[PDB]
């Protein structure tokens, strides 16, 4: 004690994060808990069937963990456009290299919400209603009881998911990337077993720059820390903040700053990121 906090897109994820922190856990142990909770209670936006990236900045260490989905080998067309999920491998890697608490415990609060249920909020019921024309089928009946999106206030229980999470908790990453879960992914996604099994996380250096006196650390390619940092620095250079009170000016200049930086990003697809973000490189931009 010790100051600490969590910001996240669901109150149950914030709650579980704070729980780990309250009892003296590290930011990365809390991060694994929150990520897994979010895949259960905010299932539309993330989960074990996807991927993502994590920036870890401590007093004297910087890391960026990249657990984004990777393309499978596939010979005909199209197929379904599904990458090998990287999320579960990501949390494991992060845990093995930066975690303290034992992994089983980090999965437990998500298991509990999947197992015993949580109360659905506005955004989830709305997301389900908006997705119904695209995704609805009878396989999805727990999400649409009585053919309608589960209502705000109802308890959603996810027994299949709890089972999967328990398999991971017991076996580690093998529980997802091999065995029955992997055969289910293989059958649904049309991705070979060997592809699922071969998933690897990439570790990368953060893009380091500065903005407004701040050292800024951000996400390197294939993420877009560069574009963001560029936009930030252009905006500080040509202080559009002096136009903040005049809406059309403010907007007008943002619009400019944004095609400058998006154009730049694109002819970087059509090897050092720290260069593309320096006061001199930014100097040379328009």
């Amino acid at each position: 004690k010790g100051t600490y906090g969590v910001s996240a897109s669901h109150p149950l994820a914030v709650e579980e994060g704070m729980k780990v922190l309250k009892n003296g856990g590290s930011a990365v142990d809390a991060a694994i808990v929150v990520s897994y909770v979010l895949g259960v209670v905010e299932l539309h936006a993330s989960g074990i069937g996807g991927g993502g990236g994590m920036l870890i900045i401590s007093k004297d260490k910087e890391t960026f963990i990249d657990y984004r989905e990777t393309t499978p080998y596939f010979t005909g067309n199209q197929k379904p456009h599904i990458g090998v999920p990287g999320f579960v491998a990501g949390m494991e890697y992060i845990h093995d290299n930066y975690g303290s608490l034992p992994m089983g415990e980090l999965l437990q609060p998500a298991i509990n919400y999947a197992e015993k249920g949580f109360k659905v909020d506005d955004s989830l019921t709305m997301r389900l209603d908006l997705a119904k024309p695209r995704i609805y089928s009878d396989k999805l009946s727990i999400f649409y009881p009585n053919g309608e999106p589960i209502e705000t206030g109802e308890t959603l229980i996810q027994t299949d998911l709890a089972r999967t999470l328990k398999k991971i908790q017991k076996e580690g990453a093998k529980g997802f990337y091999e065995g029955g879960v992997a055969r289910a992914i293989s059958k649904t996604a049309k991705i070979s077993l060997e592809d699922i099994k071969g998933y690897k996380v990439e570790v990368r250096k953060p893009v380091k720059g500065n903005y407004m006196g701040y050292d800024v650390y951000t996400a390197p390619p294939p993420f877009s820390g560069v574009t963001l940092l560029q936009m930030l620095k252009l905006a500080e250079k040509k202080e559009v903040y002096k136009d903040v009170d005049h809406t059309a000016t403010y907007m007008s200049k943002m619009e400019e700053i944004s095609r400058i930086a998006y154009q730049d990003r694109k002819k970087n697809l059509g090897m050092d990121p720290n260069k593309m973000v320096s006061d001199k490189y930014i100097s040379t931009m328009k």
Binding site: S7, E15, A30, G53, H81, D121
Partner: protein, 167 residues
């Protein structure tokens, strides 16, 4: 897509964004979960994403921040960080401000704007369009640690029912 930020006792900050790409990914569902949708941007490679988990550091200040919203991510975050660094007010306050993004000569707006403004922007070849989906403008989540002493504060984006807490 979802973004979150954590700051612990010894000032380690984590800033992280996870995703299925689309809401529910491809909508394909197995062993309890939704399979991602992979946007095409060769076998074992990752596609480009606009995601950008970021940390800002000065002496006496640590900021973690990020947001979903696809290709609007840098457009969402730029104005907020701009307003914020230029002393315009509390981070939460700034997250609460109405928002706009551009797609090739269409300006998309969170809140409907005046004639005055709509004309001035029409004059630059842009055609204002107000958008219905509040989630279209992101879900910014942030924490701030300062060394007074220490206090953590932050922002949650009410557009995705987001929130934050510190001890």
């Amino acid at each position: 897509t979802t973004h979150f930020v954590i700051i612990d006792r010894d000032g380690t900050v984590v800033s992280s964004t996870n995703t299925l790409s689309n809401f529910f990914g491809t909508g394909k569902y197995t062993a309890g979960f939704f399979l991602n949708n992979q946007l095409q941007n060769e076998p074992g490679k990752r596609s480009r994403t606009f995601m950008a988990p970021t940390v800002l550091k000065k002496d006496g200040e640590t900021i973690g921040i990020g947001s979903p919203g696809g290709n609007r991510i840098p457009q969402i975050l730029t104005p907020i960080l701009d307003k914020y660094t230029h002393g315009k007010g509390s981070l939460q306050d700034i997250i609460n401000e109405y928002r706009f993004t551009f797609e090739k000569n269409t300006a998309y707006t969170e809140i409907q704007l005046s004639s005055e403004v709509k004309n001035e922007l029409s004059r630059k070849g842009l055609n204002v369009k107000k958008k219905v989906s509040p989630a279209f403008f992101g879900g910014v989540q942030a924490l701030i640690k300062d060394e007074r002493d220490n206090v953590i504060t932050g922002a949650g984006d009410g557009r995705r029912n987001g929130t934050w807490k510190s001890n």
